[PDB]
Symmetry: C2
Subunit: 147 residues, 2 copies
Amino acid sequence: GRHMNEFARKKRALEHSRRINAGDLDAIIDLYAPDAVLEDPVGLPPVTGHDALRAHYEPLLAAHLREEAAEPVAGQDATHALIQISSVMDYLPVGPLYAERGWLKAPDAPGTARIHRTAMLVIRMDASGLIRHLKSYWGTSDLTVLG
Amino acid sequence: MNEFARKKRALEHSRRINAGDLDAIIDLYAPDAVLEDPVGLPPVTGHDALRAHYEPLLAAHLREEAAEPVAGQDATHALIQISSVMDYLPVGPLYAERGWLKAPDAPGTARIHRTAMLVIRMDASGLIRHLKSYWGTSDLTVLG
């Protein structure tokens, strides 16, 4: 008994990419419901609630995570927006964790290498515009170690 | 199914739609496949309802251009963004009814553009168990 229209969900999905690029942690977290569930990537155990979300985004902000997002689409189901995201960030300090997980090799800078990743996000939003659930789909074949 | 395999099947789905052969598309689906197109509408399920879903699209000469897909680290998912164009008839009038677009001044030369993102769940054989096609009224445009 209340919901968010396609355009607001769409803009909201673009705002998530926007705030990630702006690098302010407080703003990124504000987009999530207090108990929001993040799967990044889908296939690994979910990150849930604000404190865990902060700890998830901090290393990404340290690696200077940079996203260029394509135009999102919307579901006709009152909650969803999907968006494709191309991303670049430094190998450090996240890369070694992706290496340990089995997702990529290990460059030879590594403090000058960068990582490219392609992902498609499935985003569930409630009537307040808060993200209740975000699934970031990307595999090892969507993960590349650049220069 | 490895990621590579999953990605290609996703691409193959767009290819067979473009080819226009009904049987070849349906052949990609598991016996109990579930299709949601669009997501938010009642699921289409079963061989016979899957055919009746794709038959008017084929008549509309639906063309898909697929972007590069991604795979989930979960052994089943591939996601793919799809831009599609089709003749306004015969499906347009359906969409216009529900208020998803405004009916054109032709309609015999008008086209329908659509942007969608698919979430495909496939079994070990590369058969589609579940396909969620996410597209909204704002992802739908009437051409000419």
